[PDB]
Symmetry: C3
Subunit: 445 residues, 3 copies
């Protein structure tokens, strides 16, 4: 909806509100079949280039099938095994005797058909390529003789077009140990993907969402290779199910908050930790530390709960009351006062220290704000770039309202001498108790 921002001068942090989240909570698997031709090598009298070209392209069909066969005899484990158990279970059903015969019967007349497997999964099966029809009708009557018949150059070219998708799928499945991500258009065409989305047991408001963000759907999908058996090549595409739709999502941005003394070695720093995406999820907050686990389309966010952290909903109160022991508001400390900048959703946080020249300029007006020593913030309204030292950042031109929450920087509440300057993932209340215990050691003496 409306993207807004709030910069907290007290903690040198910003929160971008107003995002609508789509959290993946389930998987929808689908079987993709390719009708193959069970043929063995045949040698006949061949000389003219058209016979050679067909036999050359026919061998690329042969090596592609054998490459997929030795891939399933020994399949190397992948780091995606903890996320593909839903689709891997489907490949084990197809390897059972008689199960490939079922999908082979349902896809006898149409491209799409629903198939009830022997494991209780009513999966939707597609036949995206038919090589048995082309080889047995156009190639076998030409090559299964004493001397090879002469094929036309149209047949040589038409067969290279059909065989191409098989070769490209074997290429991806071989280099990725049968589990590929994202799902390419070779694994599933955009036309096939939209038709697959439409047939999903999801709401009409949810089908419009996945259809407008098909590239994000591909990046959050898996393609799993199953088995080759009885002239059938089958592989499972594992598509995301977003059980959480239109949930509030905020992104926390943090920057170092140091003191501004004039002698280096006499300054202490403080920075909020656990920056990233926070979204309401099932009575708690799902935090996403990794940056690539949430795809954004500027109004919206698409996250995967596979790489998330479950936090109490009180964690959002660290932005308004950080000194409350009721919520573990975590920080890191040091004595490294180096200047930096963070480009937020509607502006930029600037931490300027030392002799560094920090500024924000407009392309046609020039320098419109020069930052002093400390932590500050600037809106994107009228600002194009932000320069910190010899580094120039670009400000996001997204429309929205920024709110500057003025307040005393909390680093000024700390006596420098007894400060813990080597804390990593420490809570605010944790550090204060460590300071109260270290001050008693000076009180008695």
């Amino acid at each position: 909806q409306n993207i807004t921002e709030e910069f907290y001068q007290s903690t040198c942090s910003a929160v971008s509100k107003g995002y609508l989240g789509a959290l993946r909570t389930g998987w929808y698997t689908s079987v993709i079949t390719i009708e193959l031709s069970n043929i063995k090598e045949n040698k006949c009298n061949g000389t003219d280039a058209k016979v050679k070209l067909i036999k050359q392209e026919l061998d690329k069909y042969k090596n592609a099938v054998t490459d997929l066969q030795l891939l399933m005899q020994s399949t190397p484990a992948t780091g995606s095994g903890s996320a593909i158990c839903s689709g891997v279970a489907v490949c084990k059903v197809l390897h059972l005797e008689g199960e490939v015969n079922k999908i082979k019967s349902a896809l006898l007349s149409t491209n799409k058909a629903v198939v009830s497997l022997s494991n209780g999964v009513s999966v939707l099966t597609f036949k995206v390529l038919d090589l048995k029809n082309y080889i047995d009708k156009q190639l076998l009557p030409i090559l299964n003789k004493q001397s090879c018949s002469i094929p036309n150059i149209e047949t040589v070219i038409e067969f290279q077009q059909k065989n191409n998708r098989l070769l490209e799928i074997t290429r991806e499945f071989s280099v990725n140990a049968g589990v590929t991500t994202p799902v390419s258009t070779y694994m599933l065409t955009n036309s096939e993907l939209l038709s697959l989305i439409n047939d999903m047991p999801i709401t009409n408001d949810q089908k419009k969402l996945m259809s407008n963000n098909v590239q994000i759907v591909r990046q959050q999908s898996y393609s799993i290779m199953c088995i080759i058996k009885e002239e059938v090549l089958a592989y499972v595409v594992q598509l995301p199910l977003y059980g959480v739709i239109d949930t509030p999502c905020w992104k926390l941005h943090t920057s170092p908050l140091c003191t501004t003394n004039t002698k280096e070695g006499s300054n202490i720093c403080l920075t909020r930790t656990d920056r990233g995406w926070y979204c309401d999820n099932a009575g708690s907050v799902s935090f996403f530390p990794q940056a690539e686990t949430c795809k954004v389309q500027s109004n919206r966010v698409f996250c995967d709960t596979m790489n998330s952290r479950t936090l109490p909903s009180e964690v959002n109160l660290c932005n308004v009351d950080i000194f409350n022991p009721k919520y573990d508001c975590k920080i890191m400390t040091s004595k490294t006062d180096v200047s930096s900048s963070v480009i937020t959703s509607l502006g930029a946080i600037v931490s300027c220290y030392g002799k560094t020249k920090c500024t924000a300029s407009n392309k046609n007006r020039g320098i419109i704000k020069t930052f002093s020593n400390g932590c500050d913030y600037v809106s994107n309204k009228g600002v194009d770039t932000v320069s910190v030292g010899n580094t120039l950042y670009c400000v996001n031109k997204q429309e929205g309202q920024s709110l500057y929450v003025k307040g005393e920087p909390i680093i000024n509440f700390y006596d420098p001498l007894v400060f813990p300057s080597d804390e990593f993932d420490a809570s605010i209340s944790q550090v204060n108790e460590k300071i109260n215990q270290s001050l008693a050691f000076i009180r008695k003496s």
Copy 2:
């Protein structure tokens, strides 16, 4: 052989035993040649589309050769230079005058031939593509006249098939600064790779291993571009030699071990460090911290010693006796009691703290175990998924025996007040001495 597991309740860690390791200790280089045609651009009377198509494809042959030439005038350094010295030394020999003339003579009649270079290396050379034969026989008599002769569409298509492998190799060598990894099927076909494996100075038991794991061999190989000189395109493929075969390998899994007090801010945590693959290697243990440096095929492990750490064999005794100062059993400490789970080889470790809902469910039975506060473990026998908060993990369905080693969690042996909660790569005996020194400061006062 038999994959087994041992979960240590005292240290919240699991060790997966029974893996057979294959550690790379050497390199076997091989020269791959492509016979090129030394031709310059020729212009003749051309109009019909077949002459244009040949000249268009002929220019793609020309720009591909010139692109490889300017790549060798200035070749950017790569991060693989510390691992390709064996193959880079071979390219420098070919750049010597008269050395390319030798391999050009040995490959005069056959595709494969052994060549003794001028540096003491008896390397095996392959001729995988012959473009000089096709250009000089089928194209030059057509184009080296006053007016161009009319080539058939079979020639136009047959030349695009042969020229394709050259264009794809130049594409990989250009984007990767002459050093590509893994070695694609364009650099070396599966047929050429198996034939190359067979001719290696390794045991017959070792040839069967590399032939059943060709994809892992590709991922642990390098393709290095040499020189283009005297109508010859040569590049070295650097293949792995596994001097260590069938060595015991165990994978250590660790999870946070915290106390279970009811007031947050009064709990301390502890976690074993240096998780990853450990393998016996030459009287010591080779530890692999990076996750991608060891490829697994579920019975076996394929690691590269390039990114390994050499540890004394006593490091394995940290799983049975962690408090022994004879071996530096390292841990990290904090006060961050956040729930998490780790999917092991035969089960899952669960560290549950706070209000987090941790559970393990079966697809048809439902919740079969609910974890309480602390660190626990569950077998894969009967378990399909593990849920921690809003995150659901998939359990590996590998067959094996798990062993639950009961014991008091070592975190209970620590007084919370004087605990060091900010140690990173500290030893157990190191921390205890720091606690004995900090307790004396309270003893005197």
Copy 3:
């Protein structure tokens, strides 16, 4: 110029001097247009394979245009937005009404033309592909009838060659959300890149530099997709401008510096931090912590200031005087004495501790130096490999002069008992004051 090295025995660090740097400080954008044909699907009497092949390839042209259209309706945000503001601003100008009509007029007769946009940018526009000319002249008179005319197989093949570049560009723009990097030869051919370099407002000495390192230029460039409007496909290529040329650049290499006591648990370690590339830049030093932000061609370095840190020029004095509080010479401390090696530009630093077998061998001479416990260094003159434990490193064979700066290891100046063994990003003067404060706590008692 001349690459030299200096190893500091006192700090276990090496500095490789003599590199000439090229720091990117600006962007030069250019518009790349592809003339498309505004056609809708037409159905006529078609049977022979040539009509089917044209209509099949024509649909791949249709889906490629529609895929680029739905990509611009909703474009996912990328992590490169902070570096593509220069090029993104150009795409917004083309989306204005009447602006695409201007470039469409300038490119009416030639491939290249300068166009003054409605935002003050005098950009250079290229027309690299003309599909409207081929479709409207060779395909529309064949297909826009009652029954389809029979096209020759030369037309079917000639159209697959022209349409291929469009399909490959749509593939890259779709998987990368309209912002691709590096810029492939499909986005911009080597012939087009060199011509684009030549027309740049840079010095003749600067054009020779970019032309000899086109692959590095591609890796530091961006390709941004603009809009499809009025039979024109336009996208911006953002090329680097190196405002800093021939600047001195040094690379700092660090290795752990531990004590050599015989009882483990009684040793302390120390390591300089902030290793990487340092270059003089505008009166300060630009430090590059990330390894991939600087491309090297062995004489030269090509860095991007987008991911850099601005430090005072006094930071170089940490190599000759580390104990001076005037510059924050930062270190990290621990008690982890594990052996390791670092391959430098002209040699190798070796930190050998414990029972580890550290050595440096020559291929024909064997072991030429055996390292003892502590930190040492070896030149590349006569050395081929360096072995530490079960790990073998390769030494860079670059020509240059090494200088061994002898000195007492600074770790011996520290009393082990009161040492801070858990400091991360701490300054030398910071740690010494923490030791002076901890010794007073023992002085009074």
